[PDB]
Design a protein around this ligand. Sequence first.
Ligand SMILES: O=c1ccn([C@@H]2O[C@H](COP(=O)(O)O)[C@@H](O)[C@H]2O)c(=O)[nH]1
Ligand SMILES: O=c1ccn([C@@H]2O[C@H](COP(=O)(O)O)[C@@H](O)[C@H]2O)c(=O)[nH]1
Lengths: 229, 229
Amino acid sequence: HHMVVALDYDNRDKALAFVDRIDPRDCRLKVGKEMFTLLGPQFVRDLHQRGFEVFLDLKFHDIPNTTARAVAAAAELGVWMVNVHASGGARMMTAAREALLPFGKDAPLLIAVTVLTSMESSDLQDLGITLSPADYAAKLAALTQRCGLDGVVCSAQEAVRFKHELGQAFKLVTPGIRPQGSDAGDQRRIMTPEQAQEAGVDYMVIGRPVTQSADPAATLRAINDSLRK
Amino acid sequence: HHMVVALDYDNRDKALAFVDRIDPRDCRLKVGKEMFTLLGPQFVRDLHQRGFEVFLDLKFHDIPNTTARAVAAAAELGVWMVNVHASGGARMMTAAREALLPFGKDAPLLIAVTVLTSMESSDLQDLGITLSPADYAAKLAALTQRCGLDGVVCSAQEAVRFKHELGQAFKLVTPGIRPQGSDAGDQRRIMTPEQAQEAGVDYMVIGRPVTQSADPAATLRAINDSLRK
Ligand SMILES: O=c1ccn([C@@H]2O[C@H](COP(=O)(O)O)[C@@H](O)[C@H]2O)c(=O)[nH]1
Ligand SMILES: O=c1ccn([C@@H]2O[C@H](COP(=O)(O)O)[C@@H](O)[C@H]2O)c(=O)[nH]1
């Protein structure tokens, strides 16, 4: 499947009120920094007990030793996917990949964030980066692949280029998904679900356009219908 | 006080075995990606119940909206200090500080990571960064100060420069503290505790040189005495 719904609530009951209205065939679920800081690993158990596979989206970005132990702790949790920041460096990503060797085929997918979907060219200029978001993401994606990771988090606007330069096997997870007529918010490098599918995206992450609608389950089912067709 | 001890255990009992042997007057405690991924916020509450102030070291690095809500979750947790990645950009750091406005003076200190103490020049060159770690950290620190944050995490090797360029009020938290004779590991920009004190650091983070000691409490007290005298 392709759809991943971001559970970005500030309340455990509110999140579970939505999850109890949907089915694991509808999507996988993403647990991010907000809900994990409030609830910790028990929330991952809450979703597993309900039959969902979980993308643990904590974007580990630390020294190699710390990043490796954090990724191993995520693997002990049994999640479907976990990610790191590619701008954490090659030694960091390699330590992360080696930390998953003890878990064999049960290890989670190991993804690296390239350039966050909220960052535009002016955002990177404050950091001294002169490359466009696409070019910098491309550089970070190639480094991630060369370090042996399974794929990258990127904007859907980079999918066609990444699939062609890095191959079909390298997995692309794209947030910054916005249907026609939904507020962009802090997102910048965006694409409709239909546009992201055409680009070759493997997994599309959607949050606020689903979780903040008058009927989140129907919105999610409506998007899935548009892509399955 | 200044000393902060990194709790980097893979088992809750092992960490509490050390914590039960020390007193809040000896140090504050740092909870990182590993222990938080294994135990979640309840572990921080356990430390508060024992009278310790906690530096929640999760290095939030995400889109502005997510980072702000994660920072708010940490403030709801009541921590003394919480950090973000300065390379997440100005909008993200600003969103994080604005997220703490509802908590008034009870807000945690908001710190930004510049260049990780494990990163040397060759590590940054894989990211297209041509500046030295000191120069690039200085650029990220300046952006952090202009975004209204309370300070940065940096190497102690940058303290004398940073205190002069960024001022006394901007707080410097430095890991990479290695008493002479002890292995550096994956740390690259390191200073002894006595050296970091002379440089003007506000808070020094020490991990493995205490926790892997056959007597961590006695080792910590010995370091504190060397800095006292
Ligand atoms: O480049 C990235 C990496 C991660 N996320 C995460 O993906 C989700 C997107 O949700 P939304 O912007 O659709 O509400 C959020 O959890 C956000 O933190 C992004 O938006 N962009
Ligand atoms: O630039 C940074 C920021 C944070 N830490 C954290 O500080 C601690 C350093 O402990 P140690 O390397 O002394 O064992 C670890 O928890 C690590 O994640 C660093 O080492 N360097």
